[model samples]
Target: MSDILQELLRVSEKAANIARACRQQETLFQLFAVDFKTLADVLVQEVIKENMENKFPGLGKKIFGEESNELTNDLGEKIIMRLGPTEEETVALLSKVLNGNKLASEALAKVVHQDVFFSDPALDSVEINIPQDILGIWVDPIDSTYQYIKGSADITPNQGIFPSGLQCVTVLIGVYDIQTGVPLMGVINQPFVSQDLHTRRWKGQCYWGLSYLGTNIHSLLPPVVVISTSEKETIKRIFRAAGAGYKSLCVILGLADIYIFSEDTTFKWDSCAAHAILRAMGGGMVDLKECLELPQLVYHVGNQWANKGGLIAYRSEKQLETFLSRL
Candidate 1:
């Protein structure tokens, strides 16, 4: 295993730490009401971008995130987002975006610079070579923000599937081959896995996988399919009859077998990480409308980043074919 994989896992955990910290701050949560949610989103994006760029200078310009690094403040001045050299500078820059709310700014900046570490014995034995020059990254700093801001714990799970809540949110980072656009490595971190009973702080879980150069390795599914809660009734009924919330994560974690959406809403960053994991585990994700022709989703396109035709993520080729036959 190259150090790249280990670094991705560590950086993802740090990103989770930031997500967890922001939710605990009263000021930051309240700021969400006035539309500061983008603060959390932008911050996470910048943190990952900054860390990856610092570690692999060659990848600095190639990394792409779902959110832009620009924001306009209440005074109508455009603020470019980036972590400063020091936490103090970061705090000062964020305070500007927060409309002078130094308290929330300071809280966020603290975690931005915090170091998080964890070791998995499973990663020590693997060895692979992937040149940094041939790799590009796609990041979705936070997915399912709807649940993140709601911060509701009461939502119950149905057969181990979270219908809704903080449990649905995730931080996704994916690395792909620049030449082929095939997802090669991915990390998905769930920032709110569960609450600590005594401390009441949130705990998180991270999962990763890599499939490249005939070396398929994974840290770790079902006939169950997950789809957007807002999916049309007809499509929902079709899938339920077979067997399915966090869409791709459910499939990636084996909580669900397939995550199918018939809409063109999900983009490259949203599916890149999970797709890599699925492929590593001998599963795959493909463009839904193009399933008849069978085209694996690729991330190297231009402004047309939308998955366009929708997608189906499955743990088994047979399972994918099963659903495709239905369509």
Candidate 2:
């Protein structure tokens, strides 16, 4: 096995162990909240120091307060003050999480910048003009807070839950060239929903799909490809031609096979660790603009901007091109 793959497997085992250990607790929900809040506090402090205080002094304290609503409201105001007022409502909603809403906290610490281009009336797409070099170091700590919340709720019913629904959450860390939108590396972590003990026996079992960017295929069988359906008609058609079917079948087959899919910015946290694993395996994550070909492996040192757009991954150039042509 390749060194990267070995490292990825090791990291994956560690993550699984963490999850399992947490599951074993009687008050998993409380533990999860504590863990998430602690991580959130750490991440918020870092963001304030790195992204806010240094860049825009005098506002960090208000945004990083311990009180949830106050922090969120202040952060929302600050974002509007700094970025603009166009997406006031969206910023407000995001601030609820970004600022310190306990319910929005998670184990991951990076902030997953949401894409505001959808039909939501409250959102407005804004072009960030910061230097690419400076932005590269930013990381989305908890890309799948919703999933984490849902998982927590499932495990502990008394606890109020937040559902990630179908949104893809990824942990993203990458190096990019500002002049050209190029991503050096990224990770995607997708947590699967396991059936309850009672259901597990009747449902047989459930397993999640896992893959890395450059890792060698341990088994000869082709891995299942995962894809997001939110792209343009042309892109979706291309993806369909490339061999992506419906979500149901893909999920079933993905357990033992490799898969491909697109997710929003929320997936950054989930994808970050996976990105590292993929790098070790010799795989890569590419944005839609660069999805036509497999990405080259490159590493960044300090201040690499991690999140920007969605990502794509494939086994090799041949595989990527073959799938693209199908689209």
Candidate 3:
């Protein structure tokens, strides 16, 4: 393997391993007692230490701001009550471990693409340019925080209602080449599932791991997973009819797949890591319309927000075409 590829894999594996450890402890109910807000607060602090006030400068201050720490603490409190961790100690421990995992993943991502330019100032009025070879990196310390807050509620809705099955949350990281807009690497950490059940959400426990492109260490199943709002009956029906198993399916056939986030909950941090990891595993994200009109690449400029809608990630062109045909 090339040096860059090797370095990427090595770091990804490290992050994935830590995530898996957190999952094992969480499922065994052995995590340190703490609230989600505390966990979220620690995570933000670590992010600032690692990325903000350094590589990105004022960017971190803008994203998290002075009140971000407090906001995360409040969010954590809500999450702790929802998840039902049995004791405050366990909640605190789990949050600490999960936050640590997030920090580790973000740190690795920053290491991988340290040279890439954000060019926030230039993006506003002038077309900023960067080397096509220097792929973009995205990190979501915690995606589906709502699900995490709800004690990992079975938030995956069927048709429109929440199912009785379990829900799986992931810490996702992804990388993409700027020129081609292709996701070259992806990693997901499900801090509550077992390794065997890593890919299976309902039957097996939740687990965490990394997936890469070209290396073929862990093969990604066909038919990329897409997230949409529960109220979108049309989209739900379309996915259901397309042979998407209810609640959980086999990993090889894209099993354990379900809905995540609401229509209004599109965030760059939420999608970045997953998008990069999926791309690395030979997948790409796009809109359902198959047009480049959507801003799949999120560029955060100070306070300006970018929202991605109806992402379609597929392992192959054939898989993508099949999914589109169903829609």
Candidate 4:
């Protein structure tokens, strides 16, 4: 409930708006040979970075790297709307056509910079560049680009298939306590997954989690509990879903009991947001290599680089340990 948190929440919807817009426009154009998440990534990341920079200039440097690949290349290089021909490049051309890049970036800053949402609970106050006092922002922009690109516009209201057959994609953003390396706040926006079926227009879910201000309990806003597993041990129920953000969102949304993964494909940005959400919601992301200790929300080693050791997320440590014990 701080100004910074309010900014994050607002920008989250704006990020969703960008993804939703990109998907919406993709319907009209039969785009081929281009990645949809590219544009979505650019719009969401740049918009959030720029908005934060406006409030506190030079802050973007601490958050992101020089290029997309610097963040992570697990799925593939983060390409920015590269394409060929007018017909194939129709949706891919948002940046160059009608100044769409400017449109999306400018939109988030408008409301975010207007005024701080002052209903904060006191410790909820945040300062710009105060090191231990400020939150570190991590963004995935678009998580499962593969699913988003493969999706068809004809998905029916009851299909539950737009997001690659399940919640396999998301726009993930997280804030960490720089001094403690603990994930404090997070927002996971799924532009393609719908919780509401009757909306005339596109309506997806933007899930959030905020950690303890005074203690004892935390906010578990999301009410669903969905889990994914390829661990193949049947220690509990499971599914063979892909994408870290997707799996993490399941736990964050309370739709899953646990999410344990580590294939070297996951990197820093992948689980940051959802990890924060789960942590605040009575669970957290664990580093398998450092199993000697609880999940330490570590970030940056010369860069906010990759999560190289493989991570696990769960609603509780006892279950998390049980799952890992089987692994």
lDDT of each: 0.77, 0.32, 0.37, 0.57
Stretches of candidate 2 off by over 4 Å are: 1-143, 152-272, 275-283, 291-294, 301-304
By lDDT, the best candidate is: 1
- Looking at model 1, the pairs that clash are 1-126, 1-127, 221-254, 225-244
Model 2 lDDT, residue 140, Cα: 38
lDDT of 4 by residue, 95-153 (tens): 34323444443332332233323232433444322243355777887777766666543
Per-residue accuracy of model 1 over 184-222 as CA lDDT, tens digit each: 998888888788767878888888889998788888522
Colliding pairs, model 4:
224-254, 224-255, 225-254, 225-255, 225-256, 226-255, 226-256
TM-score of candidate 3 versus the correct structure, residues matched by position: 0.46
lDDT of 3 by residue, 200-228 (tens): 43222221113333433333333534433
**What TM-score would each prediction reach against the true structure?**
0.91, 0.38, 0.46, 0.69
Q: What is the C-alpha RMSD of each candidate to the true structure, in Å?
A: 3.3, 14.9, 12.2, 7.6
| lDDT for model 3 | 0.37
Report, for all candidates in order, the number of backbone clashes.
4, 48, 32, 7
User: What does candidate 4 score on TM?
Assistant: 0.69
Clashes of 2: 48
When 3 and 4 are scored with TM-score, the better candidate is: 4
Model 2 reaches what TM-score against the true structure?
Answer: 0.38
User: lDDT (0-100) at residue 42 of candidate 3?
Assistant: 37
Query: Candidate 2's residue-wise lDDT over 2-101, tens digit each?
Result: 2222222223223332333333434333541123433332333233233333334442342222212222233234222132123343344444444554
